[PDB]
Write a protein that binds this ligand. Sequence first.
Ligand SMILES: *[C@@H]1O[C@H](CO)[C@@H](O)[C@H](O)[C@H]1NC(C)=O
Ligand SMILES: *[C@@H]1O[C@H](CO)[C@@H](O)[C@H](O)[C@H]1NC(C)=O
Ligand SMILES: *[C@@H]1O[C@H](CO)[C@@H](O)[C@H](O)[C@H]1NC(C)=O
Ligand SMILES: *[C@@H]1O[C@H](CO)[C@@H](O)[C@H](O)[C@H]1NC(C)=O
Ligand SMILES: *[C@@H]1O[C@H](CO)[C@@H](O)[C@H](O)[C@H]1NC(C)=O
Ligand SMILES: *[C@@H]1O[C@H](CO)[C@@H](O)[C@H](O)[C@H]1NC(C)=O
Ligand SMILES: *[C@@H]1O[C@H](CO)[C@@H](O)[C@H](O)[C@H]1NC(C)=O
Ligand SMILES: *[C@@H]1O[C@H](CO)[C@@H](O)[C@H](O)[C@H]1NC(C)=O
Ligand SMILES: *[C@@H]1O[C@H](CO)[C@@H](O)[C@H](O)[C@H]1NC(C)=O
Ligand SMILES: *[C@@H]1O[C@H](CO)[C@@H](O)[C@H](O)[C@H]1NC(C)=O
Ligand SMILES: *[C@@H]1O[C@H](CO)[C@@H](O)[C@H](O)[C@H]1NC(C)=O
Lengths: 50, 369, 99, 206, 413
Amino acid sequence: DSTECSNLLLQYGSFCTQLNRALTGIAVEQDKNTQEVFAQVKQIYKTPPI
Amino acid sequence: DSTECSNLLLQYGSFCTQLNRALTGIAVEQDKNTQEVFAQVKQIYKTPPIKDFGGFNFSQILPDPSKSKRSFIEDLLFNKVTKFNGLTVLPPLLTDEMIAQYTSALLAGTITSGWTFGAGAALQIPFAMQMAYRFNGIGVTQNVLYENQKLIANQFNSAIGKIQDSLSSTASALGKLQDVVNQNAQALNTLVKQLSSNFGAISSVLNDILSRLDKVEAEVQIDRLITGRLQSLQTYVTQQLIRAAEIRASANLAATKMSECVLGQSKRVDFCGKGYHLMSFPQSAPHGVVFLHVTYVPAQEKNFTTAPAICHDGKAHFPREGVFVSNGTHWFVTQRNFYEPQIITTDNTFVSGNCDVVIGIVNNTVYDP
Amino acid sequence: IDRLITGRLQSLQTYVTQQLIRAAEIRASANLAATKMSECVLGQSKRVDFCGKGYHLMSFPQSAPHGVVFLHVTYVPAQEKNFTTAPAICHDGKAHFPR
Amino acid sequence: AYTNSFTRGVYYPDKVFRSSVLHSTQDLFLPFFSNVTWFHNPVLPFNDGVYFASTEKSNIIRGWIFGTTLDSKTQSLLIVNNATNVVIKVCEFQFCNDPFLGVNNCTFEYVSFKNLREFVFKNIDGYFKIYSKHTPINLVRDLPQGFSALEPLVDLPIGINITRFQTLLAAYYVGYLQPRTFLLKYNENGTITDAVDCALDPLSET
Amino acid sequence: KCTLKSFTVEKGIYQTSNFRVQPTESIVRFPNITNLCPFGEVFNATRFASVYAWNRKRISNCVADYSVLYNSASFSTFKCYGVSPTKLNDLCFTNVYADSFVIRGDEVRQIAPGQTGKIADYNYKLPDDFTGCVIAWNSNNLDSKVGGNYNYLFRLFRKSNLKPFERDISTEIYQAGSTPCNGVEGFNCYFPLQSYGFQPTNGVGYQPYRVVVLSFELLHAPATVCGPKKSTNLVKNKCVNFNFNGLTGTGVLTESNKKFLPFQQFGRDIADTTDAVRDPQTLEILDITPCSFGGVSVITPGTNTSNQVAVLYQGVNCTEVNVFQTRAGCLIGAEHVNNSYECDIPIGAGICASYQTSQSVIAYTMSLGAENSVAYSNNSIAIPTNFTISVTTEILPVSMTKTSVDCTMYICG
Ligand SMILES: *[C@@H]1O[C@H](CO)[C@@H](O)[C@H](O)[C@H]1NC(C)=O
Ligand SMILES: *[C@@H]1O[C@H](CO)[C@@H](O)[C@H](O)[C@H]1NC(C)=O
Ligand SMILES: *[C@@H]1O[C@H](CO)[C@@H](O)[C@H](O)[C@H]1NC(C)=O
Ligand SMILES: *[C@@H]1O[C@H](CO)[C@@H](O)[C@H](O)[C@H]1NC(C)=O
Ligand SMILES: *[C@@H]1O[C@H](CO)[C@@H](O)[C@H](O)[C@H]1NC(C)=O
Ligand SMILES: *[C@@H]1O[C@H](CO)[C@@H](O)[C@H](O)[C@H]1NC(C)=O
Ligand SMILES: *[C@@H]1O[C@H](CO)[C@@H](O)[C@H](O)[C@H]1NC(C)=O
Ligand SMILES: *[C@@H]1O[C@H](CO)[C@@H](O)[C@H](O)[C@H]1NC(C)=O
Ligand SMILES: *[C@@H]1O[C@H](CO)[C@@H](O)[C@H](O)[C@H]1NC(C)=O
Ligand SMILES: *[C@@H]1O[C@H](CO)[C@@H](O)[C@H](O)[C@H]1NC(C)=O
Ligand SMILES: *[C@@H]1O[C@H](CO)[C@@H](O)[C@H](O)[C@H]1NC(C)=O
């Protein structure tokens, strides 16, 4: 949160967008991975009482 | 153009060759990925002149000669999906017409010969008899096809027609291919915008530095641009090497689906779509493949009383290839995937010793032919 | 010296990154070779073109430097003849199907 | 008295042709739907730059004065429409604006309700910029809806510092420019059409 | 061989170089030559400035050409200090000035950096590091008069020396004793001016020379003066280096069908690369295409097979470079062949090359396999009668060399 550094970091262009975009793609994959493993069942089947 | 920059860039040595070696390794791999998927047929099995396939109607997925000679659905797929600063884009080895000749050969061989063209020479089989083998392969007896053949054929024609023409109504189905187009375009635009960036230099325009500054200081400002532009170009080829590894995984999966679905019949659950798999047809799409998996799904939910075995002359009988079921008053044996009751005979069944051992055995009669 | 440190460090980061990406491709090939050992050598695969082109009978592993060779043995049908065929035959007014 | 600015005053940010494209820029602009002052003749602060717009039928507005003092001690800018022409000059002037027809320590000179005029005035020591547009309207006292794009008239060589301004003499409105990010819809003819004020609301930011 | 660092090459296609179409000429374009600076008033007047009270012009808001002053035969001497007279036509300034006076032929030499004596110390003072040029010309026909032209005067006496660039017009009576002069001549009290007494008969050291001194300032307010701008003819459909209004680039210039607005000067593509310009000398909008470039690839059988090769210019048209225009680029030294075969060496877009029959590199459209019609009918089946047992070799990478690097031993060692 230094304003003096922040104005220099703008002179590096797209790099900081390109990293935060890469981590967002990795974040969304973790939900996809979990959905593809567990959500294979169409209905919440449940066991008889006895 | 700048010989000043070109001479400064020599101090970094081999990096300029490493990045082009890495991009060449990726570029050679598109052509391998498409040959592993499509080029797994030895001969071009044409298409027969007379369309006597029982009731089954492949005209939506067979070639259209009025057009590349794509099928109808294969032309919907292309329509729903469909540079300068030292950057160049290279053509694929197989053209879209050569890939459409391969999907044509694969489904023409499948329709006329079954799985036989995968194991050796294509052997002709009437299409209704190929479908009876594929029913027999999912544990449903052949006569369940021949006795229902017009129903099965109408129900296939409805599913491959009415429902699959949903691709005319919506483009959002092809999101996996559109994503691969968008990611490569957005990476390549990000590589170009990085030329406008200063990286701490007095200007991002290379001739502007050389026109404004004394030669010893101009070399400091240019080395600032070289450092940032080289890091930008390394970031791009690193992300393309990582992205090409997921495309290789998808191409190895698609090549495996082309062998095990399509030119086989897979017993692997949920591999070739939901339900008990019968067939699949490949259709080409830009940068990808589409499999139309044909599959058998059962349809009832009321009940029968059942037993593991039945007693007769003090001996326990077990069903030879089926289940024992009662309609409430009478006992039958059925095949297990489709309700077709049969009288319990000594050749519907096999004995295994005494009545006393089995838990839940029932007393009934076994008929002797 | 800091110019040499900066350049040689970046040279070594570029090597290690491409080595990590290349090791992932060798791991995918070793996971495939362990699956071919299990399903082709320790079993008989009913899985089309997994254990060579043809109907798979069996397979044998041989060592190679940094790899494995599988010698896949397969039945390949040959010398076919054309016949007339029928889905069923009709006898005493009843339809018979081949067992 | 106050009035709402709506979505007006989108001057072309640079002399570049662009087409079928959505360009992003960070210039000094009217923030959308902001309040502006309404008038129908005070000396006013200039801030970071001015938007001015007026109900054109009678042509009663004659020009403007800009500078720091506007009244001796240092050079100040006069711009006036002398009927067929416009006179631009930057002397150490010292006058009231009300006697407009009556108006050396000087270094430059140059000569150039039925409607809305729209004009924008901007400076950065790197020469003094005027943009404008004109459009027909209904007989309404305040700014109408829709987008308006303002075209660069002149970029005058003056080098004068400005903190204050005044007008020579319809309704007229005064708003101020602010550092703002905009997304601009250049159509197939390379005219700016629609625009998004990226800091207005979360949907615009999206 | 040099690309591969080897004396042996295996069969393949190798990218060995990149080639680019070079610019055939340089184009420069600027607006019509207009608002040329008003220097002539300082030289061509009937009157002239008198050195005891010299006159300055201001030059601003205009384009100069100082090279007129060092090419015209109208002047007897030209001198310059600090910066070259040619460099003045490259430079730019917030204001420019021209000082003027008449001096006798023996005393024009006082107008130089760091000088001393009557003219230098009491009439016109230049510092030791002055930047500017001085123009002097004999004016005995204009400025001399019978008995002397007493309008031309120099200050002989002053209270103190001038500072550098100090202008003074003072005419106060000089005092040379304790007696107060009360603003008039008298005992030890004298008029501070003298005349060269310019007469038409005078020898050259006593003849009038008109003189002008150029001077400049560049300030935080941007330059209102610059030197002259070049321009060239306009050439199209050829690769050229170009400079429109200071915008440098290299490309092919063409006609366009774009509709620029009257204030717009150049047009941009989606990635903020220029793709069109207005010619400042017409209403023509010109489209810009970058000059044709691509990889050069060498197509070879093995070096123990043949030294013959073909060359592919990737994405380049054969117009720009026995010859064959593929979709992948111009191919040279390969024979096009109307047959088709398995793909031996891949080129792209369905094209491959091989070494074949008297032998050469050939290029052909690749064959996907033999065409076959399966003998399908609704009652025909084919059944195998034999089974040829087949052994196939599958080979897989399983591991890699266990290399390790100490980064401190590699970096420093
Ligand atoms: C096959 O289906 C198409 C519609 O998709 C229809 O036009 C055609 O007549 C059908 N073919 C036959 C032999 O009935
Ligand atoms: C048959 O199974 C259904 C499954 O939903 C169940 O609701 C029903 O109770 C069963 N029938 C009888 C007679 O219990
Ligand atoms: C059970 O099957 C037999 C033979 O089809 C039929 O006669 C009998 O009525 C059935 N019983 C019930 C409860 O439906
Ligand atoms: C089945 O369940 C019923 C009710 O729980 C019970 O009466 C019967 O004895 C059970 N039979 C077997 C074979 O488990
Ligand atoms: C089954 O039949 C036998 C006689 O064959 C009898 O002894 C036995 O009790 C019967 N069991 C049931 C559950 O009815
Ligand atoms: C008869 O069988 C052979 C088997 O190779 C096949 O080539 C041929 O096409 C068949 N005959 C006809 C008339 O199709
Ligand atoms: C663009 O320019 C053409 C020709 O001047 C004109 O016909 C068209 O209406 C303009 N607008 C659009 C949106 O194309
Ligand atoms: C050497 O020649 C043989 C036969 O022409 C060829 O197979 C091989 O690829 C060649 N190798 C090299 C390195 O030239
Ligand atoms: C090659 O360039 C010439 C001249 O521009 C043109 O006539 C020709 O059609 C071009 N050919 C291809 C395939 O681009
Ligand atoms: C290829 O065949 C066409 C047939 O019209 C002919 O014109 C052409 O000259 C042939 N090419 C060569 C290189 O012989
Ligand atoms: C089967 O093929 C072998 C050669 O592979 C041949 O020797 C043998 O005679 C053939 N048998 C028949 C019955 O055709």
